[PDB]
Design a protein around this nucleic acid. Structure first.
Lengths: 50, 166, 873, 834
RNA sequence: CAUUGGUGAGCAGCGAAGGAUUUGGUGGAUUACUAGCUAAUAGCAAUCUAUUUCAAAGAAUUCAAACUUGGGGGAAUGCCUUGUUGA
């Protein structure tokens, strides 16, 4: 962090790597921020996934 | 401004330190300006050392020792956030206290921290040296006055002389 | 005379009208009170910054001003007002028609002298009262006693004595007893000024023939006599800085300083103020200071200072001459032209008959400055031709300004009287520019205009030729020759494509600026006098000689609106920034506002003095006008900017004697429902439909991620135990028997009572109305609390309520939402008892109405099929 | 056309100062840096006032009647603004750092805490016309020995409690006759008294100190005097009380601590109702609704704004904005939403109307440089300096794919094919354009030929060619699609900083380092126009600069440009205090907009006040951090040479006014510009201007109404358009019967067809007449469908607005209607028993 | 032959009781104008201080308090912590 800020964020990106993430089925509204509105109502997992 | 003033022990020289960082040393009788610093920094207080040749300035975070012509000699990295400065002329000790609540005695001649004492009473509000016996009196936010010596880690005396900060 | 769109705000550029200013001291500081027509202004002596202005304009012009500590006394006609911080605290009304002339306040006594040699004395009701209010007595000086009163003065250390100074001699009146204590010997020359000396018992008297007398009242004898032959003393003042100096102002505009100790003249300041306007009307030494403040009738206030002597010894002899320190001023004669310098309302440009151009600041007076006339050195290197004696440029008839290229090169063009070239100025430098634009056809300059880009300047000559120069290099580029008489207006559209001109010959020429071609020519009945072009709307109005304003659209070259009603020549007019109004002034002492959409006069004013110029602020907040009398600029506030103004045409006959509501206010409120057959949504936010359906999931998102910590010992009824408002469904109180599941009579909810009332009455209009008003949480709570047990009356009634709502075709998207919530909360109950006749019948009726509302689907499906196809292929 | 006005500011919900609830409780007033933003929570609407202070706002307050608002900056400069008319009444300078301002609950008087003096003034009457000195002083009180921290009005508008840094709270009586009633000073606090309040009965006075002690004062015998009957303590280990508020009716005490956690207390029992944490940053301001059920909190560091419903433990509002971080912006194809990319690495979707962040994404590790939507609109792509390009699926909020170069290059620009099947990104250290396949994620190819870093990219929406520009002083057109790959380089006089593609796909405009906008013909590769912009650009002198602004060459060029969707205008911005809107065919400046007027930002002023300059240097450059009382403020974490990409504490220099991106609204005559303070949106919505088209003397508002009464609908409608009055168009529009709509629609002249379509789209989105508007659209499309096809770009914005209405509100209604039909049939047809 | 090299000797042209260049000092602006001091619901502004004192209120086991240190290795004697001895 310190070196990146010192170099004005003109650094050389780190080597790429692969990692695994777990996605839990939930209503799409929950993932959104809290306001008196929602943008999408779908589920977080597609029909293939289920 | 505002300006904190400290005269020399013999009264021949005047040291002035503005809050915004205008520090000047002058012989006020003959109107000769010995040094003038325009440090772009917040200066709280300044004091003369053994004579007019050297003086100390308590800046934003560190205390700096300067020469007669204004040349910086030392940056006292050990003294942090000092707001009050005093010099014991017979012992050649420089004393500081500030927001850290730490009383530090520094020997100008040898340049070694003689002792650092923990006040444990929060930021120091006032300071005054007892010229007769060189005992330092610190006032605190709890309204007590503590007497200190460099050779005792605990205060010599504690006096309750106010209901609020001294 | 009162406008419905505009209201006076203040005057700009006027510092003093010539009445002697008053000086008052608050602590160590000093302030100066100067008269400006019917209002006075207070300046700080240290900076000459305006502090206060009188809250309201006095009915009559102020004649005298006296200030003591916080309070200021202003005399007008037969009334004396007392002001503090510019706000009137008390008004003293004298009981005689004679107008007040002179005013003196010492201690608790206020002395007012009327022009009939009557002195009115007012006293404080209480010793600690701030100002005198109570009427004490009246002292009258008869012709035998003395001549006309010159001034009222009070000398120090005199108990209850007023030193009345008359033309013939001086008198000493005891105000407490109202008796003539002493009468001075008659003086051969008429007295014009009096001033108490810093010494005791001595008052300096100034005669009409250049003689100053140090009259001693205690001895009643002359002490000294200064002589200034062929001069008239207008003011006197002593230096209290420890130096025995006396400053003598003269009506000639000169200020002389004498050293009383040495009997010598220190210096003379020549022509500090104009002789034509009264010279030095007032010149006062600031108490205990070397600064002397001078004023005159030329709308100027100056300060001079005496520097310390340059000689280490004999500083008394070697006296430095006074030095100009600071001053404030304005035009000496009424402004001839005005213009707003910038898009915001910061600065105004002004020109006057005194041959001076000023830049006036509305936001602060100190920022006001005069633009220099110092000329730049010629680029060629030849010597510039002009008189060695320096003179100001002639009066400015026209002005054009742009801010596209401010700071890059010249951005103002001005036209001068009887002059065959136009001068340029620089607003950033506040100095005359280095270019001069000549007509090149031996004609005077009548019109000046600039392009929006700030690169070109257009000059219209009295011989009909239009010359076009480049502002950066001042090189003549193009010359158009269509008009044979004077060109009185030139304008170019914002796009720099189409250019329009007008002249006294009556033709309106349309040119293509880029191609340099004559697009068209339009002839009007009468000679055209002026032009204003509105660049945003591409409309320009022309003031014809037949007392009409003709609005023309440059795009189509046709007259769109013609305005009638003025009884005399139109001096000036301007467009409103939105392009919807025109405000015009004429010689018949009226200012009319015209509404272009309806082409009628909506507002009318009658000005005491003819308004020579009218200008809107580009913001539209302010309207600035100048008048044939008065050195300042009248600023009006646009009331339409804070409320709607009716556009009903003004009554012509009533205006002459003095000398569909939605359409009137230019608004329209959409109907509740265009037709019964047409489906209409609810009158509210469109998120209400979404909030109701997905309430639970939205609230789950709202809950904090980590459970909040709370004290174990918490009141169980804390929410209810509230000192006293919350209007939620929970905070409902019953309104005033066998137990009933839904609600017991006298203990029933408001909604359920409405539901039961509707069922018997066979109309749920009241119930449907309150459903729409319920909050989304309240709506869910009521539906979910509906009785779900046999014989299922409430569910059946609710279905009948919603079914009625769908018939109305109003708010149908809530009724669909309510029915969706009913199935969500009671779907199983309906499903289990679908065979029950009551539920089956109520459900069947709902479907009958609901089936009809499928046309909306067809309309939506059609538009998507076409709109997708049209935009794509 | 070119009549734009500042409408609202997105990207920031709170910067500093005290947030206040409206008296009705349905609107929240939040100071956003230099302006005041108003959020209508119930109606889901927001607006930001046009008036602008010259420094950041410090205190605001709205009177109970809801008519007058007073806002004060950090220098004591005050502006009185008419809330309903949104216009400024007066400007007042109090000549000192006012800490708090509060209207009396009566509304007649308002009080000022200006240093150690309490100033009470009389409220100007809103109905009265503006005058030179509208304010009238009432009294000035000087009892405190140090600055006043806050003040509280009594419920009867008769007493004021003032709390100062003197470890004291002091009470005053508004009426001189009642001075004996309240002339007491409350002592005994170890630290600053943050707040003092009255109980509902007004017989009890509560005082709260920074150390965390609550004192309960009562008038009791030891003959009667105020005494501390009870003392309560917040046993916070190190957190200090930062803001305190009290609701007398509900006896609710909400306290915000420096640790970032707030507590709700019940007085005088001192029962802890709740304790929550918003984060690690201090809670700067806390406010209570009139009913007492909503509590609004704000944190300045991250610009958070939290409205908490302590009754239900729910968040009405939970938002966090960006300051000096927005690198780019993108409109959704329908224009309902705007996306922003921040240096934090977070992509946020903001709703234009409500003004709140719908969703946030945090996959990217480093600064996000660009964001772009696919033509379809469902999918979004973003690039970041971490070296990855990420595709986002908005329907499920998943990063369904991520692209990365083999050499791990930082990406600064991005372009997406209209088909959404190819993605190209550029860099400032590679000189090549990497290309990926969306479906596969494989790197298709690397385009080479540039001799300098690639600065920008864009796909032609029709021709599907790729235009790239670099600091190589050249532009290259790549025909990547097709059996044969061709490249056509075009030379330019200077480095190319931005590039915009015509919607037609026939021309491309480029902004160069010379301050020039040059338009080239893609097919012929020859210049067709040039616009000079160096003179138009307004650039300010920085406090640290040793050279004039006129001679300064810091930023006299436009780093971002965008076409209007019609194709006749360009909006440009850069690292300067100007947004310039040019007209392409005629190459003239339609208008210039000043981005900011905040003297806090470094680049605002062309000329700096000479009084600041001294023998040492600028007075501003002196660092006054040491004077601050709190340690956290004194700490300096600044790295010596950092310029960009770190927190504001790291830079050590003032923020610089600059515009990172600009775009036109697809569906409205508006454009949005991302800047340091936030996402400024300029729109032409108000339309107060009178801009008639083809008038005659016969055309008049009266004449149109006469036509309606005579049932001449077509003439009435046409005459309304010639006047171009919104109210008159609305009146005629709703007065045409349904039977006559097909006849009128088929007979409207072609010239007025774009105007009616624009009106319907804007009117339909918020109107209640869904069916009537759909009938009109059906009539217009059927009657003049072919004409709209021939001229797509004239009707582009109007058509997108109509589609938004048919998709975002109309489809939502039938979706709710149709599911009831099926839910109905299942319940009746199906057999339910047991 | 060319100097867009320096230094001079002179015209044409411009040209109203002279013209050109450089420079010290002060004043006004460079943010949007509600007045000075104090012990401030009022006094003062020529100050009082010969009523300026009393009364009332006012003291967290927070009895906590370096959020403040360039890296590596130690620290006899100091200092901190923990136990322990004898009073």
């Amino acid at each position: 962090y310190k070196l990146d800020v010192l170099s004005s964020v003109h650094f050389v990106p780190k080597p790429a790597s692969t990692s695994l993430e777990i996605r839990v089925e939930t209503p799409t509204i929950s993932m959104e921020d809290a306001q008196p509105l929602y943008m999408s109502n779908a589920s977080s997992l597609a029909p293939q996934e289920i | 401004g505002p300006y904190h003033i400290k005269y020399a022990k013999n009264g021949t020289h005047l040291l002035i330190t503005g809050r915004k960082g205008h520090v000047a040393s002058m012989d006020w009788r003959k109107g000769q300006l010995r040094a003038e610093l325009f440090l772009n920094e917040t200066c709280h207080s300044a004091t003369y050392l053994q004579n007019e040749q050297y003086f100390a300035v308590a800046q934003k975070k560190y205390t700096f020792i300067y020469d007669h012509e204004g040349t910086e000699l030392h940056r006292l990295k050990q003294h942090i956030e000092a707001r009050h400065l005093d010099f014991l002329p017979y012992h050649y000790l420089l004393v500081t206290a500030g927001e850290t609540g730490w009383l530090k005695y520094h020997d100008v001649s040898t340049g070694q921290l003689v002792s650092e004492l923990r006040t444990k009473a929060g930021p120091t509000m006032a300071m005054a040296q007892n010229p007769w016996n060189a005992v330092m009196h610190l006032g605190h936010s709890n309204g007590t006055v503590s007497l200190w010596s460099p050779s005792m880690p605990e205060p010599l005396v504690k006096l309750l002389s106010a209901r609020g900060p001294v | 005379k009162n406008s419905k769109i505009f209201s006076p705000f203040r005057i700009i550029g006027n510092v003093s009208n010539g009445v002697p200013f008053a000086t008052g001291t608050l602590g160590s500081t000093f302030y100066i009170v100067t008269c400006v027509g019917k209002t006075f202004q207070i300046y700080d002596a240290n900076t000459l910054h305006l502090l206060f202005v009188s809250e309201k304009e006095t009915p009559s012009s102020i004649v005298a001003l006296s200030a003591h500590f916080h309070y200021v006394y202003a005399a007008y006609e037969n009334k004396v007002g007392i002001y503090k911080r510019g706000i009137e605290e008390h008004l003293l009304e004298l009981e005689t028609d004679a107008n007040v002339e002179h005013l003196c306040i010492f201690g608790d006594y206020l002395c007012a002298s009327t022009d009939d040699n009557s002195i009115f004395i007012y006293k404080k009701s209480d010793p600690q009262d701030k100002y005198p209010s109570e009427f004490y007595t009246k002292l009258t000086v008869t012709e035998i006693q003395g001549g006309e009163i010159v001034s009222l003065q009070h000398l120090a250390t005199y108990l209850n004595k007023l030193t009345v100074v008359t033309k013939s001699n001086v008198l000493l009146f005891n105000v407490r007893t109202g008796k003539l204590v002493f009468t001075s010997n008659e003086f051969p020359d008429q007295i014009t000024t009096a001033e108490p000396a810093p010494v005791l018992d001595i008052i300096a008297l100034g005669t009409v023939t250049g003689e100053v007398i140090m009259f001693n009242m205690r001895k009643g004898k002359r002490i000294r006599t200064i002589k200034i032959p062929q001069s008239r003393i207008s003011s006197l003042s002593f230096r209290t800085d420890g130096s025995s100096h006396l400053s003598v102002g003269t009506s000639s505009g000169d200020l002389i300083f004498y050293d009383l100790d040495r009997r010598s003249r220190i210096h003379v300041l020549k022509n500090i103020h104009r002789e034509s306007y009264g010279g030095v009307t007032q010149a006062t030494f600031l108490n205990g200071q070397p600064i002397i403040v001078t004023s005159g009738g030329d709308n100027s206030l100056k300060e001079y200072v005496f520097d310390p002597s340059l000689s280490q010894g004999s500083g008394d002899v070697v006296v430095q001459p006074p030095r100009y320190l600071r001053s404030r001023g304005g035009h000496s004669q009424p402004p001839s032209y005005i213009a707003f310098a910038d898009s915001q309302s910061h600065f105004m440009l002004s020109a006057s008959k005194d041959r001076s151009l000023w830049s006036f600041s509305l936001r602060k007076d100190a920022q006001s400055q005069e633009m220099s006339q110092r000329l730049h050195k010629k680029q060629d290197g030849g010597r510039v031709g002009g008189s060695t004696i320096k003179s100001k440029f002639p009066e400015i008839v026209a002005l054009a300004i742009e801010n596209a290229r401010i700071g890059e090169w010249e951005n103002i063009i001005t036209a001068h009287k009887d002059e065959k070239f136009a001068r340029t100025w620089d607003m950033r430098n506040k100095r005359v520019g280095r270019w001069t634009f000549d007509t090149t056809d031996d004609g005077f300059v009548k019109s000046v205009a600039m392009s929006q880009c700030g690169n070109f300047g257009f000059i219209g000559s009295s011989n009909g030729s239009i010359t076009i120069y480049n502002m950066q290099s001042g090189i003549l580029r193009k010359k158009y020759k269509l008009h044979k008489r004077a060109v009185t207006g030139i304008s170019l559209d914002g796009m720099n494509r189409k250019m329009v001109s007008c002249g006294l010959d009556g033709i309106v020429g349309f040119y293509d600026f880029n191609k340099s071609t004559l697009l068209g020519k339009l002839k009007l009945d009468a000679p055209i006098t002026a032009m204003v072009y509105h660049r945003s709307s591409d409309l320009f109005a022309l003031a014809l000689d037949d007392l009409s304003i003709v609005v023309i659209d440059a795009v189509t070259q046709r007259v769109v609106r013609q305005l009638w009603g003025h009884s005399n020549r139109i001096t000036a007019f301007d467009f409103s920034p939105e392009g919807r109004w025109i405000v015009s002034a004429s010689l018949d002492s009226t200012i009319r506002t015209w509404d272009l959409p309806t082409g009628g006069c909506i507002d009318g004013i009658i000005v005491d003095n003819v308004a020579t110029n009218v200008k809107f602020s580009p913001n539209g907040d302010l309207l600035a006008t100048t008048h044939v009398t008065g050195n300042g600029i009248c600023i009006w506030t646009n009331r339409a900017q804070f409320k709607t103004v009716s556009t009903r045409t003004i009554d012509e006959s009533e205006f002459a004697r003095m000398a569909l509501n939605d359409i009137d206010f230019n608004t329209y409120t959409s109907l509740e429902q265009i037709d019964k057959e047409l489906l209409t949504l609810s009158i509210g936010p469109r998120s209400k439909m979404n909030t109701l359906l997905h309430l639970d999931v939205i609230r789950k998102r709202s809950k904090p991620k980590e459970a909040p910590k709370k004290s174990e010992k918490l009141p169980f009824f804390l929410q209810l135990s509230g000192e006293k408002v919350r209007e939620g469904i929970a905070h409902e109180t019953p309104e005033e028997n066998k137990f009933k599941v839904t609600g017991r009579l006298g203990f029933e909810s408001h909604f359920t009572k409405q539901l039961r009332e509707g069922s018997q009455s066979k109309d749920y209009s009241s119930l449907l109305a309150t459903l729409i008003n319920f909050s989304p949480a309240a709506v869910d709570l009521e539906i979910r609390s509906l009785n779900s047990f046999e014989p299922f009356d409430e569910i059946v009634w609710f279905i009948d309520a919603l079914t009625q709502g769908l018939k109305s075709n109003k708010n149908f998207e809530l009724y669909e939402t309510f029915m969706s919530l009913l199935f969500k909360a009671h779907g199983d109950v309906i499903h289990a008892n679908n065979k029950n006749q009551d539920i089956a019948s109520a459900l069947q009726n709902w479907e009958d109405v609901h089936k009809k509302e499928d046309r909306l689907d067809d309309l939506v499906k059609f538009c998507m099929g076409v709109a997708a196809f049209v935009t794509t292929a | 056309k070119s009549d734009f006005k500042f409408s609202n500011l997105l990207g920031t919900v709170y910067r500093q100062g005290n947030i206040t609830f409206s008296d009705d409780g349905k609107q929240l007033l939040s100071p956003v840096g230099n302006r005041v933003s108003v959020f209508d929570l119930i109606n889901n609407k927001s607006f930001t006032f046009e008036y602008e202070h010259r420094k950041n706002i410090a205190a605001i307050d709205l009177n109970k009647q809801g008519t007058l608002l007073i806002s004060i900056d950090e220098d004591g400069r005050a502006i009185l603004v008419n809330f309903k008319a949104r216009n400024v009444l007066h400007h007042f300078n109090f000549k000192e750092k006012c800490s708090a301002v509060k209207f009396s609950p009566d509304g007649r008087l308002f009080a000022l805490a200006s240093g150690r003096f309490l100033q009470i003034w009389k409220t100007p009457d809103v109905n009265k016309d503006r005058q030179f000195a509208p304010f009238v002083r009432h009294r000035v009180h000087a009892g405190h020995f140090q600055d006043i921290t806050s003040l509280t009005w009594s419920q009867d508008s008769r007493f004021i409690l003032t709390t100062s840094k003197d470890l004291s709270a002091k009470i005053w009586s508004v009426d001189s006759e009642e001075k004996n009633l309240a002339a007491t000073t409350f002592n005994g606090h170890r630290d600053y008294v943050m707040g003092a309040f009255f109980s509902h009965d007004q017989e009890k006075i509560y005082t709260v100190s920074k150390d965390g002690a609550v004192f309960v004062w009562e008038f009791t015998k030891r003959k009667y005097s105020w005494r501390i009957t009870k003392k309560h303590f917040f046993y916070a280990n190190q957190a200090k009380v930062k803001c305190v508020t009290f609701h007398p009716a509900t006896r609710l005490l909400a306290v915000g601590f420096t640790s970032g956690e707030f507590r709700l207390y019940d007085l005088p029992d001192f029962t802890l109702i709740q304790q929550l944490s918003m984060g690690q940053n201090p809670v700067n301001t806390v406010s209570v609704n009139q009913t007492g059920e909503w509590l609004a909190f704000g944190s300045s560091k991250l610009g958070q704004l939290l409205v908490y419903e302590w009754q239900s433990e729910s968040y009405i509002l939970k938002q966090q904005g960006h300051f000096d971080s927005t690198n780019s912006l993108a409109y959704s194809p329908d224009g309902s939403r705007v996306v922003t990319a921040s240096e934090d690495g977070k992509i946020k979707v903001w709703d234009i109307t409500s003004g709140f962040c719908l969703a946030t994404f945090e996959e990217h590790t480093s600064s996000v440089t660009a964001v772009q939507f696919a033509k379809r609109g469902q999918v979004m792509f973003s690039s970041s300096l971490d070296g990855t390009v990420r595709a986002w699926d908005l329907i499920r909020y998943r990063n369904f794919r991520t692209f990365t170069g083999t050499e791990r290059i930082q990406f600064n620009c991005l372009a997406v094919d209209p088909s959404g099947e190819v993605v190209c990104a550029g860099s400032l250290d590679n000189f090549d354009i990497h290309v990926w396949s969306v479906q596969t994620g494989q790197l298709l190819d690397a385009l080479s030929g540039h001799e300098g870093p690639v600065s920008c990219l864009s796909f032609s929406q029709e021709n599907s060619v790729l235009a790239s520009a670099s600091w190589d002083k050249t532009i290259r057109i790549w025909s990547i699609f097709g059996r044969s790959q061709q490249v056509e380089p075009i030379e330019v006089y200077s480095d190319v900083l931005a590039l915009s593609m015509r919607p037609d796909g026939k021309e491309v405009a480029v902004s160069t380092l010379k301050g020039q906008i040059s338009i080239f013909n893609i097919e012929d590769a020859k210049q067709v126009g040039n616009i000079d912009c160096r003179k138009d650009i307004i650039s300010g002198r920085f406090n640290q600069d040793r050279f004039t602004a006129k001679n300064s060459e810091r930023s006299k060029f436009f780093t971002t440009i965008h076409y209007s969707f019609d194709g006749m205008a360009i909006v440009a911005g850069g690292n300067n205090n100007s947004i310039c809107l040019y007209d392409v065919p005629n190459e003239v400046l339609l208008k210039r907009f000043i981005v900011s007027r905040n003297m806090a930002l470094n680049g605002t002023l062309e000329f700096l006040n000479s009084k600041k300059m001294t023998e040492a240097g600028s007075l501003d450059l002196i660092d006054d951090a040491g004077e601050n009382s709190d340690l956290e403020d004194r700490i300096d974490n600044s790295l010596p040479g950092s310029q960009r990409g770190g927190d504001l504490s790291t830079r050590k220099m003032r923020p610089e006014v600059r515009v990172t991106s600009v775009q036109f609204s697809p569906t409205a005559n508006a454009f949005a510009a991302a800047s340091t303070e936030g996402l400024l949106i300029y729109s032409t919505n108000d339309t107060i201007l009178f801009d008639p088209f083809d008038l005659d003397v016969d055309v008049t508002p009266h004449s149109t109404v006469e036509a309606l009464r005579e049932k001449q609908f077509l003439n009435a409608l046409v005459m309304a358009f010639r006047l171009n009055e919104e109210y008159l168009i609305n009146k005629v529009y709703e007065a045409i019967p349904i039977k006559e709509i097909p006849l009128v629609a088929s007979n409207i002249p072609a010239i007025y067809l774009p105007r009616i379509l624009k009106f319907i789209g804007d009117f339909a989105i918020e109107s209640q007449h869904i069916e009537f508007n759909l009938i009109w659209i059906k009539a217009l499309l059927s009657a003049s469908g072919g004409y709209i096809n021939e001229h797509k770009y004239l009707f582009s914005t109007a058509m997108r607005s109509i589609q938004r209405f048919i998709v975002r509100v109309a489809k939502e209604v039938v979706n709710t209607t149709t599911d009831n039909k099926y839910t109905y049939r299942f319940l009746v047809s199906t057999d339910g028993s047991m």
